[PDB]
């Protein structure tokens, strides 16, 4: 994509924010029409701005657009928690197709932070019949998009079988993730307690189970 936008953009609560969109000499972002797309990753996107500063029907007037002689601009007044997602710009003509840009992640801060919900699960009896063992560490309802998970067998670090997901946005404007630990029945029987530690940026939630209990 020669259509270059802003790298990564943050913002504050109830303020404005600006996203850029420009590119190549052929793609001079001038005699061409510009549109903007709100793209929730993995869900239904939305057209908000089409062909110029004119916005789509139903869009609140908090959004606005501008077109200079070499680039296009997106302005957002009164930032809301549901606006915390990635946007994209497209340049096109009446006959040519769409040309997406590089992308611009948006993070609106100044909101009420969320204390996380971390839950630990052992393998059940049916998995003990399967001769495997999987610790399940589920994370939800935390505001900043950064978590670090550590697995400790008898309070001793584990490196093999450690898998941790990526932060995923909860539909309630929070975040969610998970992490698993695969172990063998020999390593399941030869330990006392298992620990999943999730180090938050302002706290740390640790959950401890045991095969004997």
């Amino acid at each position: 994509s020669v259509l270059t936008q802003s790298a990564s953009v943050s913002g504050s609560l109830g303020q404005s924010v600006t996203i850029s969109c420009t590119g190549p000499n052929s793609v001079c972002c001038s005699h061409k029409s510009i549109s903007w797309y709100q793209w929730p990753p993995g869900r239904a996107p939305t057209l908000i701005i089409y062909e110029d500063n004119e916005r789509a029907p139903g869009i609140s007037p908090r959004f606005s657009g501008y077109k200079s002689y070499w680039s296009a601009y997106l302005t957002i007044s009164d930032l809301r928690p549901e606006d915390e997602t990635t946007y994209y710009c497209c340049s096109y003509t009446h006959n040519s197709g769409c040309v997406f840009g590089t992308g611009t992640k948006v993070s609106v801060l100044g909101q009420s932070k969320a204390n996380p919900s971390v839950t630990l699960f052992p393998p059940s009896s049916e998995e003990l019949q399967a001769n495997k063992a999987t610790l399940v560490c589920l994370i939800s309802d935390f505001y900043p998009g950064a978590v670090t998970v550590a697995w400790k067998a008898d309070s001793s670090p584990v490196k093999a079988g450690v898998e941790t997901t990526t932060p995923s946005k909860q539909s309630n404007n929070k975040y969610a993730a998970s992490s698993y630990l695969s172990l063998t029945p020999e390593q399941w029987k030869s330990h006392r307690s298992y620990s999943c530690q999730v180090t938050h940026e302002g706290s740390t939630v640790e959950k401890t189970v045991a095969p004997t209990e």
């Binding site: 006959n95 699960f121 998970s178």
Partner: protein, 240 residues
Amino acid sequence: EGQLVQSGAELKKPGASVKISCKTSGYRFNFYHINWIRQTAGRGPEWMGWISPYSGDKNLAPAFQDRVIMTTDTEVPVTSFTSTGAAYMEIRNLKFDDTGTYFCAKGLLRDGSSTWLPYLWGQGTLLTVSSASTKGPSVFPLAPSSKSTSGGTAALGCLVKDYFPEPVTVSWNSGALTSGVHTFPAVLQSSGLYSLSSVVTVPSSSLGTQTYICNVNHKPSNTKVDKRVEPKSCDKGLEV
């Protein structure tokens, strides 16, 4: 009120071909262009091409001029303002770069400078170009877990593990349970395996009045697994 539906998930090999449908409803099929745009993680989204069911005029990207063929049927008018058409798309010469979610959408306006612009999008259709084999999943139950000891909330679910082809949808009690249903994304193993889980937050008092059965429906493998989660807990924070 146009409620469009695309095709189902399918698995193919590189160098082969696959055909994706795009069934429409609730609007005049011949009044709007039909766009087709993909989303691949290797090059981001790329506009593939649009077509006109009325005038029979298509327009592809020069990169898709040889391998993409888009066809449309004639609309089936239901009322004076509603028709049920169909738009198919066949793609050949499958490579590793053509793996992702594909979309078809309705044109914007019937006249003006932006007529074909995609407004109403379909739900999408994920394709994975792989030489591997279709392997069914392994579905396990999950032991209930305490979520709030003072509140009394349990968390029970099902575990879909080790399936190579397209992902799987899961219902609860034949779709009779939607409150608390929270589904986790899949994994990527070193061998190329995908595996996820699902869970629901149930009342701790709901152990002798309701029954919770998860229903896994793997369509590319054409399998179904109906599991019953045992109400006997094992978390020390949940027995109370």
